[PDB]
Amino acid sequence: TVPDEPVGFWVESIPGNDHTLLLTWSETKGAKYYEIYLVSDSTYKFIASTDKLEYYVTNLSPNTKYTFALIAVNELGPSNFVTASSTTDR
Numbered sequence: 001t002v003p004d005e006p007v008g009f010w011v012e013s014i015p016g017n018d019h020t021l022l023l024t025w026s027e028t029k030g031a032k033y034y035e036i037y038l039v040s041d042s043t044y045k046f047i048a049s050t051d052k053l054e055y056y057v058t059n060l061s062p063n064t065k066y067t068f069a070l071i072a073v074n075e076l077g078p079s080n081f082v083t084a085s086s087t088t089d090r
Contacts, residue, residue, distance in 0.1 A: 003030035003072035005079040011068060011086035018062035018088045023070070024054040028079070031072035039067040039083065049073075062088050 008026040023036060033051045037044035047068070048055055060066060067085040071078045 001030060002077040003032075003074050003079045004028050005082055006031070006034065006070055006072050007082070009068075009070050009082050009084040011066065011084045013086060013088075014056075018090050019058065019060050021057050021060060021066060021086055021088065022054060023057060023068060023084070025070055025082075027053060028072040030074050031079075032074045033072075035071050035073060035078075037069040037081075039069055044069050044081075060088050062090055064088050 006025040006028045010024050012022045014020050014022055033049055035049045036047040038047050065087045069081045069083050071081050
């Protein structure tokens with residue numbers, strides 16, 4: 001089957017850094033990789049694909065609320081999307 005939807009998707013600050021966010025999520029049944037999107041103007045814009053359980057999104061603007069969407073993917077297809085948000089507030 002396609003993978004489960006990831007859970008525990010969190011967007012975390014990096015201490016003293018207002019240009020980066022650390023995304024993390026749980027290990028997901030069936031997942032061969034994960035794909036991350038930025039939710040921008042109520043559309044999804046590709047950011048990265050990874051086989052890890054975390055990803056640093058860099059070159060962000062300070063004082064901005066960012067929302068991301070995450071899927072898990074295998075050969076059969078993707079899971080549903082899950083979202084999470086945080087800010088780069090100084």
